[PDB]
Design an enzyme around this catalytic site. Structure first.
Site, PDB file in Angstrom:
ATOM      1  N   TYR A   1      13.338 -12.873 -12.054  1.00 47.14           N
ATOM      2  CA  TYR A   1      12.982 -11.819 -13.014  1.00 47.14           C
ATOM      3  C   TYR A   1      11.494 -11.816 -13.357  1.00 47.14           C
ATOM      4  O   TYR A   1      10.863 -10.763 -13.478  1.00 47.14           O
ATOM      5  CB  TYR A   1      13.720 -12.024 -14.341  1.00 47.14           C
ATOM      6  CG  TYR A   1      15.205 -11.764 -14.355  1.00 47.14           C
ATOM      7  CD1 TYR A   1      16.072 -12.672 -14.964  1.00 47.14           C
ATOM      8  CD2 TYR A   1      15.741 -10.584 -13.843  1.00 47.14           C
ATOM      9  CE1 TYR A   1      17.432 -12.411 -15.068  1.00 47.14           C
ATOM     10  CE2 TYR A   1      17.107 -10.311 -13.944  1.00 47.14           C
ATOM     11  CZ  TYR A   1      17.943 -11.231 -14.559  1.00 47.14           C
ATOM     12  OH  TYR A   1      19.287 -10.976 -14.678  1.00 47.14           O
TER      13      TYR A   1
ATOM     14  N   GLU B   1       0.938  -1.112   0.000  1.00 43.94           N
ATOM     15  CA  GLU B   1       0.000   0.000   0.000  1.00 43.94           C
ATOM     16  C   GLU B   1       0.983   1.165   0.000  1.00 43.94           C
ATOM     17  O   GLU B   1       2.034   1.088   0.649  1.00 43.94           O
ATOM     18  CB  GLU B   1      -0.877   0.034   1.255  1.00 43.94           C
ATOM     19  CG  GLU B   1      -1.868  -1.129   1.396  1.00 43.94           C
ATOM     20  CD  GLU B   1      -2.621  -1.456   0.110  1.00 43.94           C
ATOM     21  OE1 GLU B   1      -2.886  -0.537  -0.698  1.00 43.94           O
ATOM     22  OE2 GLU B   1      -2.961  -2.645  -0.085  1.00 43.94           O
TER      23      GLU B   1
END
Ligand SMILES: [Zn+2]
Ligand SMILES: [Zn+2]
Ligand SMILES: [Zn+2]
Ligand SMILES: [Zn+2]
Lengths: 179, 180
Positions: free
Chosen positions: B128, B13
């Site tokens: 990745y 958040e």
């Protein structure tokens, strides 16, 4: 222009770090909601200095010289901004701004470079992401059998790559999605 | 099962959408196996940030983060970016090896941008690859709109509730949108 059309994009870079690497190739295309390619955008080798190119590591040198991109980059008369504008001129004819999520493979990485070097183009996309790699990663774990059905060439050529991503998604729609 | 196949799910958040001007105010993680079975829940941490930084939040962020009680937790928190990053890594190292799991979540690229900027060690812990559940929602929205109504999100932007919801959303699509 139709708000239901999708914008697909793929980039090639001198490396993986937006802070030090640069965009050396960009390709875009537009498809309808059913993955039909309606039109190919410009495939542009983005000009970058020889000094910048000299910083590429082994993988990047081998990859981008084998495709002929390095030579195209050095001869290119279109830098980031010129390539961005040319791409926008194309997209405006097929999709309204802020409607299409960014479509591609491991697209978050490309978006990082768009944020830093082509912010206007980045802003043309809706907040959302449509990363085809999600299906591959799920199939890899839940239905490996279909993985061998579609093969990626890994040539790192912008237009071939993005068209391949569209074909890959179409493949998974048939073999992995339950309509 | 092999720990190398465990998946790391994460949700953050923030005070806003721009990594250069905004900061992380909450982080939550959890680990599942390859088939979405939740093996362990990570810490849910309100990341301390200055009142000056919080005062920069726009209307949406003020409404959203005060309604969840996050703002108060942030102000009382004694764990900043680094402390939160270290605590999260302390947990993850017990369940998944470094560089094996793609980053799992919803519209996860946005979260990754903040990890690159403020928690690079944690960002580096991931492989990745990306595993964004939103891809399925976007496809269903266009090819099978009906199933979207079968799963309701709360949209409260609470890190742990959100990430658990993301796993549940993926399980929902595996059952109603995926051909196994
Ligand atoms: Zn490519
Ligand atoms: Zn590439
Ligand atoms: Zn959240
Ligand atoms: Zn949120």
């Amino acid at each position: 222009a139709n708000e239901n059309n999708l914008i697909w994009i793929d980039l090639e870079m001198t490396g993986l770090d937006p802070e030090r690497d640069r965009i050396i190739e960009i390709a875009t295309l537009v498809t309808d909601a059913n993955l039909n390619i309606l039109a190919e955008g410009p495939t542009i080798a983005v000009h970058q200095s020889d000094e910048q190119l000299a910083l590429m590591d082994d993988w990047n040198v081998r990859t981008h010289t084998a495709s002929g991109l390095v030579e195209r980059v050095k001869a290119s008369t279109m830098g980031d901004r010129e390539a961005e504008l040319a791409t926008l001129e194309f997209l405006k004819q097929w999709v309204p701004a802020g409607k299409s999520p960014i479509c591609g493979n491991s697209i978050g990485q490309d978006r990082r470079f768009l944020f830093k070097y082509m912010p206007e183009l980045e802003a043309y996309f809706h907040y959302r992401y449509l990363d085809v790699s999600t299906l591959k990663e799920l199939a890899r774990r839940w239905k490996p059998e279909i993985l061998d059905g579609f093969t990626k060439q890994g040539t790192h050529q912008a237009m071939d790559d993005i068209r391949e991503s569209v074909a890959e998604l179409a493949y998974y729609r048939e073999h992995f999605i339950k309509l």
